[PDB]
């Protein structure tokens, strides 16, 4: 299309394509002293609001906004429905800034109608480790769309990030925008076939009768890696070394400190599940997935799709296929209806064998103020929320 906001930003033009040797900002030698100290102007009747995500009621306001107004399927039957506890987890990572949790209220009602957030993350792109902001949960009320409010929320968080002497960010979206560094399709592994069939997530065809679809997806309730267990605090140094060593092979990944591993992976019910295999006091395999329900739009029988999303999975004692089979099984044991995954890291390699179906669209990865060659999603080693 035209990208009249994006073309004023430091991001590639749609036709830009860079050599592998290119790996730099679009704009360097930036100065915290020069950054605007004034808040970006909102339309008359709207005000900035600083959300405190540790405050139950502020967190609840953001929860309601996203519940009613966040990402939907381009057929409009499902809306992402992140839990309040998930938001807490997602937004209170180590060294997070309260002031990168930005809301917009309509003054006359005092209601939150807009939101955008960022957490700090060390990101390695093509073997350069950069302090970045990981931006997410950009949301404008459905009553207020196409009013050019998103660029205000965007310019306003950029300014707040820049005040911290950070000049780059990472972000993902399903819409195509100038310009992805990688593009990863999503795949779904049915667990509760019948429910999926009933709510129109999956389909039957004459050869695949209901009972055949159910038999197709059925799994044995026995782990390939028998000692896979919920991670605990004692496990963090071992996960740090396992995952950390594994991630170094990729073109794009997060460099986690121990404190970050503890946050990202220590299990929280209905938010984040990590399983580990400990052999001789070493952590040799891990599995992790997060909970992201979709509200079912207008179904007289089901209100919620329980979905597990593949997070970080490493094996040194089994095949990757065996590990991901256990991951599916662990997700089944925790009452999930489906197991989603992106064609990132080694995932694509197992989708056919493990009966994944191809989804409808893809997820684009983006960098802000960074210039580099684009790459296929198997070289992507980071999963955003
Ligand atoms: C160094 C620091 C850097 C910090 C910042 C880095 C950058 C971070 C960037 C943000 C990353 C967030 C990642 C994220 O949270 C994960 S992706 C999910 C985003 N949220 C949703 O989709 C919720 C449902 N939709 C909405 O709330 C609205 O449709 C939104 C608010 C998306 C757009 O509201 P709207 O009412 O429909 O639209 P206008 O206000 O009229 O604005 C139109 C302008 O916004 C551009 N747009 C639309 N969707 C976008 C998107 N998903 N990313 C970036 N840009 C997006 C669009 O191309 C157009 O610019 P253009 O004319 O050039 O085409
Ligand atoms: C986003 C996604 C999908 C997926 N999205 C859709 C369309 C949709 C929209 C709203 C509700 C339900 C469905 N269909 O599938 O599967 C995925 C599998 C893995 C990861 C995905 O994206 C996540 C990381 C980035 N932000 C949100 C979740 C996705
Ligand atoms: Cl401006
Ligand atoms: Mg708008």
176 lines ligand 1 (CB under 6 A): no
384 lines ligand 2 (CB under 6 A): yes
Asked whether the beta carbons of 167 and 27 are under 8 A apart, the reply is yes
List, in order, residues 6 or more apart from 31 with CB less than 8 Å away. Answer: none
Buried b (16+ CB within 10 A) or exposed e, 283-319: bbbbbbbbbbbbbbeeeeeeeebbbbbbbbbbbeebe
Asked whether the beta carbons of 156 and 46 are under 8 A apart, the reply is no
Query: Hey, whose CA ends up nearest to atom 3 of ligand 1?
Result: 158
Ligand 1 nearest atom to the CA of residue 149, by list position: 40
The CA-to-CA distance between both ends of the chain, in Å, stands at 27
What does the alpha-carbon distance between residue 366 and residue 385 come to, in Å, rounded to a whole number?
14
CA angle 171, 175, 181 (to 5 degrees): 50
What does the alpha-carbon distance between residue 100 and residue 121 come to, in Å, rounded to a whole number?
13
47, β-bridge pairs: 105
CA distances for 358 relative to 208, 249, 289, 327, 352, angstroms: 17, 26, 19, 18, 9
CA quadruple 9, 32, 53, 368: dihedral sign:
positive
Asked whether the beta carbons of 104 and 43 are under 8 A apart, the reply is no
List, in order, residues 6 or more apart from 372 with CB less than 8 Å away. Answer: 18, 20, 22, 23, 24, 125, 126, 181
CA distances for 354 relative to 187, 217, 218, 269, 316, angstroms: 11, 9, 11, 26, 19
List, in order, residues 6 or more apart from 174 with CB less than 8 Å away. Answer: 71, 361, 362, 363, 364
Query: Hey, whose CA ends up nearest to atom 52 of ligand 1?
Result: 173
351 lines ligand 2 (CB under 6 A): no
- Rounded to the nearest 10 degrees, how much is the dihedral formed by the CA atoms of 198, 203, 209, 214? -70
Query: Hey, whose CA ends up nearest to atom 23 of ligand 1?
Result: 70
What does the alpha-carbon distance between residue 135 and residue 123 come to, in Å, rounded to a whole number?
13
Q: How was this structure determined?
A: X-ray
186 lines ligand 2 (CB under 6 A): yes
Phi, psi of 136 (to 5 degrees): -160, 170
Query: Hey, whose CA ends up nearest to atom 38 of ligand 1?
Result: 146
Query: Hey, whose CA ends up nearest to atom 25 of ligand 2?
Result: 385
Name the helix (H) or strand (E) containing 132. strand 128-140
Q: β-pairing, 338-342 with 307-310? A: parallel
For a pocket test of ligand 2, which of 73, 136, 311, 336 has the largest count of ligand atoms closer than 8 A to its C-beta?
A: 73
What the block records as the tokens of 264 is 């990202």
What does the alpha-carbon distance between residue 71 and residue 361 come to, in Å, rounded to a whole number?
13
What the block records as the tokens of 246 is 């594994």
CA distances for 302 relative to 196, 272, 298, 337, angstroms: 10, 23, 9, 12
CA angle 60, 275, 182 (to 5 degrees): 70
What does the alpha-carbon distance between residue 95 and residue 292 come to, in Å, rounded to a whole number?
24
Relative to the alpha carbon of 119, which ligand is closest? 1
Provide the 10 A C-beta neighbour count for residue 74: 10
103 C-alpha to center of ligand 1: Å?
15
CA angle 244, 246, 248 (to 5 degrees): 75
Decide if domain 1-385 falls under CATH 3.40.350.10. no
What the block records as the tokens of 16 is 């830009």
Asked whether the beta carbons of 137 and 100 are under 8 A apart, the reply is no
Ligand 1 nearest atom to the CA of residue 140, by list position: 27
Q: DSSP assignment of 78-105, as one string?
A: EEE---HHHHHHHH--TT--GGGEEEEE
CA quadruple 69, 70, 72, 77: dihedral sign:
negative
Coil, strand or helix: which one is 47? strand
CA distances for 266 relative to 226, 248, 274, 334, angstroms: 20, 22, 7, 16
Coil, strand or helix: which one is 214? helix
- Residue length of the chain: 385
Instruction: Answer yes or no: is 138 a known binding residue.
Output: yes
Q: Which of 106, 104, 57, 62 has the alpha carbon at shortest distance from 83?
A: 62
- Residues, CB-to-ion distance under 5 Å, ligand 4: 140, 147, 149
Q: DSSP assignment of 100-122, as one string?
A: GEEEEEETTTTEEEEEEEEEEEE
Ligand 1 nearest atom to the CA of residue 6, by list position: 63
341, β-bridge pairs: 187
Asked whether the beta carbons of 344 and 320 are under 8 A apart, the reply is no
- Helix H segments across the chain? 56-69, 84-91, 149-162, 193-198, 210-217, 236-247, 258-265, 320-333, 348-351
């Amino acid at each position: 299309m035209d990208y009249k906001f994006w073309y004023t930003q430091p991001v590639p033009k749609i036709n830009d394509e860079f050599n592998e040797s290119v790996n730099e900002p679009f704009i360097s030698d930036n100065k915290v002293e020069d950054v605007r100290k004034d808040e970006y102007k909102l339309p008359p009747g709207y005000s900035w609001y600083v959300c405190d995500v540790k405050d139950e009621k502020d967190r609840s306001e953001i929860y309601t906004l996203l519940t009613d107004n966040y990402v939907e399927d381009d057929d409009n039957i499902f809306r992402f429905n992140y839990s309040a506890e998930f938001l807490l987890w997602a937004l209170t990572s180590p060294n997070y800034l309260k002031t990168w949790h930005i809301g917009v209220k309509y003054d006359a009602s005092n209601k939150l109608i807009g939101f955008i957030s960022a957490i700090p993350t060390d990101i390695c792109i093509h073997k350069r480790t950069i302090k970045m902001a990981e931006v997410n949960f950009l949301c404008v009320h459905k009553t207020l769309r196409s009013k050019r409010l998103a660029p205000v929320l965007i310019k306003e968080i950029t300014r707040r990030i820049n005040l911290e002497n950070i000049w780059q960010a990472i972000y993902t979206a399903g819409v195509y925008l100038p310009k992805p560094v990688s593009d990863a399709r999503y795949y779904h592994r049915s667990i509760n076939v019948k429910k999926l069939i009933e709510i129109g997530f999956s389909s039957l065809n004459s050869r695949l009768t209901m009972s055949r679809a159910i038999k197709l997806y059925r799994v044995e309730d026995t782990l390939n890696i028998k000692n896979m267990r919920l991670m605990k605090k004692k496990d963090v140094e071992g996960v740090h070394k396992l995952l950390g060593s594994y991630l170094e092979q990729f073109n794009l990944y997060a460099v986690f400190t121990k404190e970050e591993i503890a946050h990202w992976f220590l299990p929280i019910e209905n938010v984040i599940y990590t399983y580990v295999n400990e052999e001789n006091g070493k952590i040799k395999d891990m599995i992790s997935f997060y909970s992201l329900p979709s509200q079912i739009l207008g179904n007289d029988k089901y209100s919620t799709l329980n979905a597990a999303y593949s997070f970080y999975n490493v094996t040194t004692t089994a095949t990757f296929k065996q590990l991901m089979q256990d991951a599916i099984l662990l997700a089944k044991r925790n009452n999930f209806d489906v197991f989603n995954a992106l064609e990132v890291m080694q995932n694509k390699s197992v989708f056919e064998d493990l009966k994944f179906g191809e989804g409808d669209g893809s997820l684009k990865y983006y960098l802000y103020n960074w210039k580099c060659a684009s790459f296929a999603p198997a070289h992507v080693g980071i999963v955003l929320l």
